[PDB]
């Protein structure tokens, strides 16, 4: 049981590192999409202006 | 005069006006009646300290009886809501001596039509609470309640079920058999595609890992745990890493459209034969009700049907057949 | 038009999707705790949540945190559902405020609702709305329901567009139809400006029309 | 004699007045509920090395309840919920004022003509330090009292375990020889089929009594009884249930929990620290008395003791002693927190044993069934052999 | 008595092998997993920041 707890700690650490990388990537993707939409709207408005 | 009027009038007024149509009024009446029982109790304690206990016993009996009588209201939704909200130590008036005794029957009477399956999860939580001081030996009597909740309608009620699961794992007293039973059952349900259900399952899993813990965890579950853990990398005392170890939950939508069907029961046998093909000797495709079965099978296979699916698919598919018979009977109304 | 006293019926409605996107993903708060990644939005093509909705008469609770049934939004949050809140029509009708939340995992250890807003059950003049009232989102925060509600959901350029559209569609337009077409065309430009507007969270709240006059009936408390 | 009680569940100081000494048995429970923050429904208390208090017997019946031999209390919900024993320490207003005053005194500069106020503050600080040392001594006593409540918990575990082992191992061992007795039962079941045939062949003074006995033990009921007795009597049903009962016992059997660290080994260090704190309080009192004697010396110093810097020296000594005392106050607060710390550390093994208890409570329902079954077996052997003779 | 001793010992031995060293093998995985995931998370944080 003790070894199981230690291994759970370490393996959950590695997995949490991966999961954090993943969530950061998802947020970056959402931000990039928002930026692209804003850039498109800005370009259209700039042409009209 | 105040000491004398406390119980006499307090119960008198509480009852005389207790009769009211408003279900919310009745639930409030219940919560306030609990408060007023605490009040009369403090009044008796102060009288004892100031100025035998047999009156105290009669009062506590009246308290438990009042809790039950309140449970007699037809607005079962009202009772469920009031209990779930107040907690009130679940009326803390009869305990295992009588709380199990009359409370088991009272909750069982709730086993009517499951329209409010959310109320079903609420009742599961309420049973877990009643497990606090009523289930040492009737814990198995809840195990039949465990199966009944397995018969519950709401998948949100299913998340509430995993919650109350961990809750009993704390409470316990009927675990070992039901313990391994739930371990095996979840093993296929591991990749369960219900984010609420998946997370609450990982949580009940960590709670059980605490409760049974020991090497018992390894042998009993870790084999059942292997059905989901992509890697043995998790703090089983934790649910987030635990799920991280587990494989990604399968598309519940795909089986649901599969679930949406009617004759999948025989299609279920066909899927079992296909699994045997995966691990066995079935090379051929029997002559099922070809159009729908074949269409769905090809759609799923081309969809990316992977190796690990079929087993947990069949397990939760028996669960499905249950829930689907449930839906068909609900169509009666 | 109708008086609220007679009905006193329980609350029920339909489900709609929130306009506010999950750009509220706590980038730094994500950088802190591992649980949040377990967020349904954090890990799905879209985000489902556990709905919570209640009504409080100027802050006094009058119903339960109603939650919708199991439905799919992890790939598209398009909500096509109904919900029956626990508030009677006459129940605390005066100053009643529709507060709600949706429970979605702020983390594996943080699965709960963090979105809330409060709006009066009736309108700014007292008429009840049984029609969709898209709500102003208060992300990373939940509803309060008080008369001084801290997360307004329902009661300017977009305001002008909406008010003019309501007036015209009420039957307030002259036989010169050409404007209505141009009216919608320019409402298109106004909505385009509003959508180009960012750093805001919104939600579409669809009050279910009542089969009593069979509309988004305007009820007034009495 | 006022009741002395420590919530063995907390092993914490929550005493009772003699006012409840002679009141009803439930009076102690209601006192824990009201005076103590310990309700009734989810609560428990028993006699260490003795039985759990009944509803009638007085404490002294199991002589206890003293400041050195009190009764042990357990909040049922305490382990029922995870509830690492909460130490939501009451308002530290005394401790907060102590901290504020100590900070001021450390920030207090040398006193020139302020010697009287400095001596007054030093005396107040010494009295407060003595009061806090006494409170911490009572705390170390309550730690030894948690140790005594743990002894009581081990005794209660041993007792309940003895009852459960009695019933269980009784039914079990009885079946153990019942194995050959099981072959005899098989012969009896052959005779039972024979008796069923005879009764079919025997439709219908001592005969009157036998028939009366037949009225509540109908033929179909007895046949079902024998059938189920054999079926659940599936020897594995015991041997597997045997492993089950052994597992319940083991679940009780957490040896390391009781032998935590030689709790007396650490309690000795705790008592030594309490002694050091008392010595510090005595030294602070001695320094305050020296400060009074020094006020007298400064008053008489106008003529014969004209050496300078007396007031500055007094203020500096007061500040130094205040800093020293505040230092020990640090260990005092550390022990205040270690209260809840060791409380959860115990609640761990507590829950271990308690869950063993609930599982073995299911096991004991099974064991009452096993009694009933072995009884059915033997008593039926005799009486139903008679009734089947026909 | 020996029967009860066995009733405990058989169950105890059941999981003893069931306590598979697979995770014991997983123990060394953290060593390679740990520093690499640390570098990866730092890079992901920098990317998210930009």
PDB file of N, CA and C in Angstrom, chain B residues 53 92 132 136-137 170-174, chain D residues 24 26 34 41 80 358-359 361-362 365:
ATOM      1  N   UNK B  53     -35.944  11.800  33.243  1.00  0.00           N
ATOM      2  CA  UNK B  53     -35.558  11.736  31.839  1.00  0.00           C
ATOM      3  C   UNK B  53     -36.584  10.979  31.009  1.00  0.00           C
ATOM      4  N   UNK B  92     -32.342  12.872  13.051  1.00  0.00           N
ATOM      5  CA  UNK B  92     -31.583  12.416  14.216  1.00  0.00           C
ATOM      6  C   UNK B  92     -32.486  12.079  15.394  1.00  0.00           C
ATOM      7  N   UNK B 132     -25.546   6.837   7.816  1.00  0.00           N
ATOM      8  CA  UNK B 132     -24.708   7.328   8.903  1.00  0.00           C
ATOM      9  C   UNK B 132     -24.973   6.569  10.199  1.00  0.00           C
ATOM     10  N   UNK B 136     -25.579  -0.407   9.730  1.00  0.00           N
ATOM     11  CA  UNK B 136     -24.504  -1.317  10.120  1.00  0.00           C
ATOM     12  C   UNK B 136     -24.744  -2.733   9.606  1.00  0.00           C
ATOM     13  N   UNK B 137     -25.966  -3.235   9.776  1.00  0.00           N
ATOM     14  CA  UNK B 137     -26.351  -4.544   9.269  1.00  0.00           C
ATOM     15  C   UNK B 137     -27.309  -4.475   8.094  1.00  0.00           C
ATOM     16  N   UNK B 170     -17.340   5.084   2.489  1.00  0.00           N
ATOM     17  CA  UNK B 170     -17.094   5.630   3.819  1.00  0.00           C
ATOM     18  C   UNK B 170     -17.960   4.922   4.859  1.00  0.00           C
ATOM     19  N   UNK B 171     -19.277   4.932   4.650  1.00  0.00           N
ATOM     20  CA  UNK B 171     -20.192   4.311   5.603  1.00  0.00           C
ATOM     21  C   UNK B 171     -19.936   2.809   5.714  1.00  0.00           C
ATOM     22  N   UNK B 172     -20.132   2.066   4.621  1.00  0.00           N
ATOM     23  CA  UNK B 172     -19.773   0.671   4.596  1.00  0.00           C
ATOM     24  C   UNK B 172     -20.740  -0.268   5.272  1.00  0.00           C
ATOM     25  N   UNK B 173     -20.191  -1.337   5.855  1.00  0.00           N
ATOM     26  CA  UNK B 173     -20.959  -2.295   6.654  1.00  0.00           C
ATOM     27  C   UNK B 173     -21.706  -3.326   5.812  1.00  0.00           C
ATOM     28  N   UNK B 174     -21.659  -3.213   4.486  1.00  0.00           N
ATOM     29  CA  UNK B 174     -22.082  -4.289   3.593  1.00  0.00           C
ATOM     30  C   UNK B 174     -21.182  -4.380   2.364  1.00  0.00           C
TER      31      UNK B 174
ATOM     32  N   UNK D  24     -29.760  11.649  35.669  1.00  0.00           N
ATOM     33  CA  UNK D  24     -30.040  10.450  34.897  1.00  0.00           C
ATOM     34  C   UNK D  24     -28.851  10.091  34.000  1.00  0.00           C
ATOM     35  N   UNK D  26     -28.867   9.477  30.730  1.00  0.00           N
ATOM     36  CA  UNK D  26     -28.896  10.337  29.554  1.00  0.00           C
ATOM     37  C   UNK D  26     -28.485  11.762  29.888  1.00  0.00           C
ATOM     38  N   UNK D  34     -25.039  19.801  25.100  1.00  0.00           N
ATOM     39  CA  UNK D  34     -25.217  21.231  25.325  1.00  0.00           C
ATOM     40  C   UNK D  34     -23.918  21.900  25.757  1.00  0.00           C
ATOM     41  N   UNK D  41     -27.241  11.888  18.847  1.00  0.00           N
ATOM     42  CA  UNK D  41     -27.489  10.799  17.906  1.00  0.00           C
ATOM     43  C   UNK D  41     -26.188  10.176  17.417  1.00  0.00           C
ATOM     44  N   UNK D  80     -17.756   8.656  11.760  1.00  0.00           N
ATOM     45  CA  UNK D  80     -18.742   8.445  10.707  1.00  0.00           C
ATOM     46  C   UNK D  80     -18.466   9.352   9.518  1.00  0.00           C
ATOM     47  N   UNK D 358     -18.155  -1.887  11.387  1.00  0.00           N
ATOM     48  CA  UNK D 358     -19.390  -1.894  10.604  1.00  0.00           C
ATOM     49  C   UNK D 358     -19.447  -3.106   9.682  1.00  0.00           C
ATOM     50  N   UNK D 359     -18.321  -3.423   9.040  1.00  0.00           N
ATOM     51  CA  UNK D 359     -18.261  -4.633   8.232  1.00  0.00           C
ATOM     52  C   UNK D 359     -18.517  -5.866   9.084  1.00  0.00           C
ATOM     53  N   UNK D 361     -20.181  -5.811  11.626  1.00  0.00           N
ATOM     54  CA  UNK D 361     -21.571  -5.697  12.049  1.00  0.00           C
ATOM     55  C   UNK D 361     -22.486  -6.396  11.058  1.00  0.00           C
ATOM     56  N   UNK D 362     -22.239  -6.177   9.771  1.00  0.00           N
ATOM     57  CA  UNK D 362     -22.851  -7.045   8.773  1.00  0.00           C
ATOM     58  C   UNK D 362     -22.493  -8.499   9.047  1.00  0.00           C
ATOM     59  N   UNK D 365     -24.630  -9.756  11.900  1.00  0.00           N
ATOM     60  CA  UNK D 365     -25.942 -10.175  11.420  1.00  0.00           C
ATOM     61  C   UNK D 365     -25.845 -11.565  10.801  1.00  0.00           C
TER      62      UNK D 365
END
